[PDB]
């Protein structure tokens, strides 16, 4: 077998120069395909060209930043020294300019839009003040992250809701998700037959969750999710001055659930401070997961609003966390250790797809069973309250009626008009007590009723509300914050970090409240930036 | 933050006087609501007043018994001494009075009712004699628990089946369960749609199990289940003289399954004797769980009979256990340790609801899969037997035909007439070989056929039987005693108590047989107390 | 209790003579039933008589072989010595006779059948040559097992496909499975109702898997599966000269899955060589399980072909394994330890049935979820390829189109004509990339289209192919070889044998390729033995 030995020797001698050549050939083939498509017709091949251009730009950018990091740092050093020298007097000028800009924006846009937007701004101020008043360490507050997070939220709102480029970009992005969630019908129609629509939720909506979980697992295997997570976390870390671990977890909670996001920094969990753990739990409560995005979109909830709220919930979560539980210790973990994410154990793309598919069984099972139990409990409680109410000639007493008055003030401060505040309060109660699935189902009911166009009032009962109120509710209801989530979060985090069980149990409730407050702040900004139709 | 320190100091100084005042205010509000409802209309508010009165009475009773236990014991001591002094001659008088009462009741009621009731009494005697003959230690029999359990069963039967108060109370109690099992339709119609009735069992009956499991978990969190369990166990312990652990487990098996009832005394399992372990397994085999009560009621089985049999199966189980495996060792565990039940790990009511909902997934999955497999096996076996039978010009051979002759004597001794004994034997075989779900399904078929009113015989084949036979079958079929339950019971108990694996495997079959005998004794009492229509 | 002691003493004294008498009485009763049935009518009772005769013959044979093993070995010794003495010159004569027989069979049958059969023979030769060329140790090849396995495949093909006895026997055997898979409808119609056919796959096909798993568990408890496995493994061990462990696992993979077959030799896994482990994984990839046979038969795939391919895949797997990774070490495990199979933990038949039923939940769940995900991915990929294709005025681009050209040569060498090779290639791609469920679904579509009788071509597109091509595809697609199976096989085997994780991961890909090659060799033999209609 001399030939086999010669082949092995040749492979070992120039292994690097062989795989690199193969990859170069593949890249050349792809580029040839792209250029040929452009030559045959440019307008038809435009998106492929754009994708190729952006990918090339990002690859070159990453290569340059990895290669010339030290030179760039040295080149940026003198400016930082000059700014630090003149800061003691330039800070007042910068702060005054920002305050004047805020005042001018208020006077010339928010006052023009109406009273409800000013009420949204006042509600934002009130929520921040209440978060500060009940803070764990009111005298140890670092105010840089709070202002920077609020400002990042405001900038995102301006870019997405008040400019044609961002509005078009996010409308397109949402429209792509609607097309993408239709592919699960292919499997749903075979496993459950052509009559799979006879049972809409179980046989059409949960398959969307399965498919999205599979796709997310595949993307995590490919390393595309961590690439975006690192960029977002670096932005929030360089602006807000937050710790690398909490920044990474907040950036990852945009796309990942609360029970899986901490796995990004699993090795370093035992050494995190109490403030970082509280921030992790708040970020886990203040966001949703991509797996359940398709279900909410199928209900009828706007995809653009959901994406915008998911993006805006990270800085809000970090700001509310740092204001509700500021850091009094010294962090140990550094940026390099935080930004590395140990990838799963998948040998290829199809194994990752199968692993993502398998993990979705318990998710959908728990969703279905919890929905059944919660709706049965709701029916029983409403019946019991009607039984009690009839003893006072008020058989209309119900859970919705009580929630319409208990949670009304929170909706009013978010900029919802007087009439629709009592209707948003019911959704707030639904989310608080059972989950965000029921609240979004009711919101979809209301949206469909509005779209139909029937009467707004029947027998003195309001049937649907405005579109601005629907948007505010969509922003407010985007979160996994409920009492039931508390225990499972605690158990899973204690499981991941047994040694921190004492600390985990102490901050869970504050993290839940902070997540709620962050969702409400996102809703306040959305309300103050939206006009009245 | 001086204000925060002052508030913390005030909270710490008078923590007891603050929460107590809050609870007092809540109680005052509830009482104000009740009295206002009564004032506005008394007849309409009567049940609320009754519930409040009974709750107040029980609270005061528990407080007094906890406070003045020693004084009451000292006050009762002299009478016990006098009774112990005169017992050596008063025992014969008491026993003769009881025997004379039994003879008079027989002569003047059971003989009037007919022959079948006397046959039921003879069957009870025969079952007790057979249990004694094949006893593990026939010479170590303590006869107090056997007679006391049989007497408690007889008293319960008299109270519930032969008096208007108890009959009305249990009919009302059963009617409340029927109303309560309709609330799961709210969740079933959303998760599975308005067409959830197209698949009756899977999409309407299992949700009832889920909802009942959730409610039971919530009640266990609230501590209401243990309150009733302690009372029942104290009654059976002070009358029958049984050990606290086995009494507690028997009282808990009325509402809880066989695989979860032992958790009430989990810490003390490794130190229980062999007789106590056998009694635990018998009590686990002789009862059902509240989770599956709603399914049987949905089939069409009487709820009152099911509740009565569940209540009556505990003393019967303990008596048959103490007669089939009497105690030859010394018990170690005391009353205080047995009556304390370590509650689960739930921080609030909604977490308990979610935990109860999640645990029901495997239950319903196993139920469905086992039913599928058992029915497929039944079809295959019937086909094979018909194939064999045709070789003798008897293609009618089937599993039902064989069971109608194998188990006929057991039904006859229970007081079922000659004709319907062959039909009850089929249900007995169904329960023995597959489970109690199939037997109750067949019984529901028979009940519906009787209710329709069609011909009782077609082509010489009996279609339905009497209502007394249906009641006897309902009493006899109430149990988790089957060969399949044996292994899972063994595995779970060995799991809970690894050190007792050798002892657990030795008594499981005797416990199963004892559970069957206890169910049959309950059926015998029901048959001897029911009249012929 | 003197009577009890006397009974215990009598039972202990003659325990052996009592159970033996009981068994003798049962056997006498069975024989009396059989003889009475024969007397009443012989033609009607013929199959029962045949079954009894064969069972008696096998029992007597096993008894004699166990009793007189040494005497038979001594009686056979002299002939072996004479053959070993004359072998050095008799081997050439035997080999020449075999080669002449092969040449004569070719010339006088395969050339008569047509060109495609000669192409099948050439493809068999080419696959063997390619397996040898890329062998792990080309210079350590033991050629006895390769030739013996190919010859056993050829003999099985001749017996089953070219003789009336075998053809009738296997047609009858397949027809019995079709009758047997109809019994699950009894359970499926109750759990899911009379409308269970509205969802064909989920509510009719998976119950077949559950029932077959239950039956296989019951048969394993009864010890009937190991009885056949030992016979087949002894045949392959005495002919091919393979190790006992790999022979046993190959014989067991005919009826058992790849994740459960290794349990037959679980204790001895840590001491197996690398070649034996590779052979185990190849045998696990080259066969199917009886649990999923009923689903494929329900789709419309021939049962006789499936059984024949399952039987023929074992020697092919062993030959390809020994040619792709020959043995360079010394085996430690002996025949006695390999042939003993530690049976499960079931106390009776019904416990085994329940255990088999419970284990099927995850199987069906994974099947359904994987099918959903794979079909959604297929739809998305086809849409994306059409999007790309339209940029070159070829919107017909699809996964099927690419596979019809990538895998065409493999189908052509298997003896499929030019036209149908492009259609078999699509099925090959389906099996390779997703699983054998999709490929068999598409094959059932094609078979139904052929059966209908419509036009073979519409608008220049071929709709269905010949029956010989369908048979070849059925033989080729019978296997669990896919990329997704690789990881789960690796994880499960590493789980069973943690100490061999390094060796397990090294041979999995070669085992997968060997399984594919073995399936293709079975297809080549089937094609060369089938005529053109
Ligand atoms: C248009 C709608 C949204 C616009 C969002 C725009 C948000 C940007 C708004 C304002 C940008 C300018 C903010 C500068 C404020 C100083 C913060 C600081 O670090 O010093 C702290 C003052 O901390 C305080 O107590 C100040 C709190 C009162 C200020 C309310 C305004 C004390 O020092 P530190 O502890 O080292 O911190
Ligand atoms: C459009 C209408 C409304 C306007 C929207 C405004 C949106 C602007 C959004 C965000 C900018 C908010 C900056 C908040 C300043 C907090 C003060 C602080 O301690 O941090 C200081 C950083 O130095 C700075 O202050 C940052 C200056 C850059 C401002 C340009 C934007 C010092 O940091 P430290 O020593 O580590 O403490
Ligand atoms: C109306 C239908 C239902 C009515 C139920 C009413 C049930 C109440 C029936 C009868 C109440 C009176 C029972 C008193 C019997 C003595 C039991 C006792 O402890 O002594 C034992 C006699 O043990 C025996 O051997 C006696 C067994 C035969 C008696 C059959 C009657 C020996 O002493 P011990 O070992 O210390 O015990
Ligand atoms: C309605 C028509 C039919 C009648 C139904 C009768 C229903 C009565 C139901 C139950 C009463 C059955 C009592 C069985 C007596 C067993 C004898 C025994 O050893 O225990 C004795 C207890 O002392 C007693 O015997 C209990 C006396 C109270 C009887 C009032 C009821 C001594 O206990 P020990 O020393 O620990 O041994
Ligand atoms: C009809 C269709 C199907 C018919 C199947 C019939 C199959 C039976 C076909 C042929 C039966 C005769 C086979 C005998 C061949 C010798 C094998 C042997 O053990 O010696 C080896 C020769 O190893 C080689 O290199 C020979 C390879 C070329 C031979 C191709 C023919 C070397 O010694 P070894 O290492 O000790 O081994
Ligand atoms: C129908 C038309 C086509 C014909 C189909 C033919 C089907 C025949 C199928 C299978 C027979 C193929 C035998 C392959 C021989 C390999 C050579 C080898 O090394 O093993 C030798 C065994 O001794 C033998 O060679 C076996 C001789 C028996 C042949 C009768 C059949 C020596 O073994 P070793 O010393 O351990 O090395
Ligand atoms: C949730 C995670 C991701 C959802 C975000 C959208 C991801 C896919 C959108 C593209 C889509 O579905 O249309 C496809 C485009 O096909 C492609 O362009 C895919 C190329 C790779 C085909 O549909 P078309 O674009 O209408 O043509
Ligand atoms: O924990 C979760 N992790 C997820 N990852 O995709 C998805 C859902 N959930 C839980 O399910 C509830 C309803 O969605 C939600 O409140 C949340 O607590
Ligand atoms: O073990 C159990 N524990 C339960 N707790 O609620 C409910 C059911 N079961 C098992 O399911 C079978 C059919 O109900 C029954 O025979 C019993 O063995
Ligand atoms: O591993 C398995 N073991 C089985 N035992 O009965 C049955 C199926 N499977 C897997 O399911 C896939 C599709 O059937 C198949 O490719 C195979 O990988
Ligand atoms: Na998240
Ligand atoms: Na019970
Ligand atoms: Na197999």
TrEMBL record, chains A, B, C:
Transmembrane spans: 20-42, 48-66, 87-108, 114-134, 141-161, 200-222, 234-257, 277-299, 363-385, 397-416, 472-496, 508-529
One GO biological process term: purine nucleoside transmembrane transport
User: Which of UniProt's keywords are assigned here?
Assistant: Cell membrane, Membrane, Transmembrane, Transmembrane helix, Transport
Domain Concentrative nucleoside transporter N-terminal residue range list: 123-194
**Which family does the record claim for this protein?**
Belongs to the concentrative nucleoside transporter (CNT) (TC 2.A.41) family.
Record-annotated Nucleoside transporter/FeoB GTPase Gate domain positions? 202-300
List residues of the Concentrative nucleoside transporter C-terminal domain.
Answer: 305-527
Protein name per its UniProtKB record:
Sodium/nucleoside cotransporter
Location of this chain's protein in the cell: Cell membrane
Q: Which GO terms describe its molecular function?
A: purine-specific nucleoside:sodium symporter activity; pyrimidine- and adenosine-specific:sodium symporter activity; uridine transmembrane transporter activity
Q: Name one GO cellular component term.
A: brush border membrane
Q: Which gene encodes it?
A: SLC28A3
Topology in the lipid bilayer:
Multi-pass membrane protein
């Amino acid at each position: 077998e001399r030939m086999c030995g010669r082949m092995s020797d040749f492979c070992r001698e120039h292994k690097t120069t062989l795989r690199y050549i193969i990859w170069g050939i593949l890249i050349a083939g792809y580029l040839a395909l792209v250029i040929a498509a452009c030559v045959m017709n440019f307008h038809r091949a435009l998106p492929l060209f754009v994708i190729t251009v952006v990918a090339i730009f990002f690859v070159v950018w990453d290569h340059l930043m990895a290669k010339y990091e030290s030179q760039i740092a040295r080149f940026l050093s003198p400016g930082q020294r000059l700014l630090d020298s003149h800061w003691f007097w330039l800070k007042w000028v910068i702060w005054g300019c920002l305050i004047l800009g805020v005042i001018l924006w208020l006077v010339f846009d928010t006052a023009k839009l109406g009273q409800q937007q000013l009420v949204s701004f006042g509600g934002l101020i009130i929520y921040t003040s209440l978060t500060f008043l009940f803070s764990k360490h009111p005298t140890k507050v670092y105010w840089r992250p709070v202002f920077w997070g609020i400002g990042l939220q405001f900038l995102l709102g301006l870019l997405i809701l008040r400019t044609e480029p961002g509005f078009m970009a996010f409308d397109w992005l949402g429209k792509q998700v609607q097309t993408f969630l239709g592919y699960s019908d292919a499997g749903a129609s075979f496993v459950f037959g052509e009559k799979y629509t006879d049972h809409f939720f179980a046989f059409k909506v949960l398959p969307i969750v399965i498919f999205f979980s599979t796709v997310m697992s595949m993307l995590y295997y490919l390393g595309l999710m961590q690439w975006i997570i690192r960029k977002v976390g670096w932005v929030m870390l360089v602006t807000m001055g937050t710790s690398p671990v909490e920044s990474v977890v907040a950036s990852g909670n945009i796309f990942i659930g609360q029970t899986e996001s901490p796995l990004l920094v699993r090795p370093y969990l035992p050494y995190v401070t109490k403030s970082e753990l509280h921030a992790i739990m708040t970020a886990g409560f203040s966001t949703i997961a991509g797996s359940v995005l398709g279900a909410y979109i199928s209900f009828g909830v706007s995809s653009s609003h959901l994406l915008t709220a998911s993006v805006m919930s990270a800085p809000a979560a970090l700001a509310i966390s740092k204001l509700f539980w500021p850091e009094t210790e010294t962090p140990k973990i550094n940026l390099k250790n935080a930004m590395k994410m140990e990838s799963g154990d998948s040998r290829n793309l199809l194994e990752a797809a199968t692993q993502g598919a398998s993990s979705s069984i318990s998710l959908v099972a728990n969703i279905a069973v919890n929905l059944i139990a919660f709706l049965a409990l709701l029916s029983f409680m409403n019946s019991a309250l009607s039984w009690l109410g009839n003893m006072f000639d008020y058989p209309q007493l119900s859970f919705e009626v009580i929630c319409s008055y208990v949670f009304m003030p929170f909706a009013f401060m978010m900029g919802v008009d007087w009439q629709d505040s009592f209707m948003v309060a019911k959704l707030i109660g639904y989310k608080t007590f059972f989950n965000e699935f029921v609240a979004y189902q009711q919101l979809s009911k209301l949206i469909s009723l509005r779209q139909v166009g029937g009467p707004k009032f029947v027998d003195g009962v309001q049937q649907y509300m405005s579109m601005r109120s629907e948007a505010i509710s969509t922003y407010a209801l985007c979160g996994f914050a409920n009492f039931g989530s508390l225990g499972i979060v605690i158990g899973g985090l204690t499981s991941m970090a047994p040694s921190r069980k004492r600390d985990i149990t102490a901050g869970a409730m504050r993290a839940l409240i902070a997540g709620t407050i962050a969702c409400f702040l996102t809703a306040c900004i959305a309300g103050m930036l939206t006009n009245t139709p």
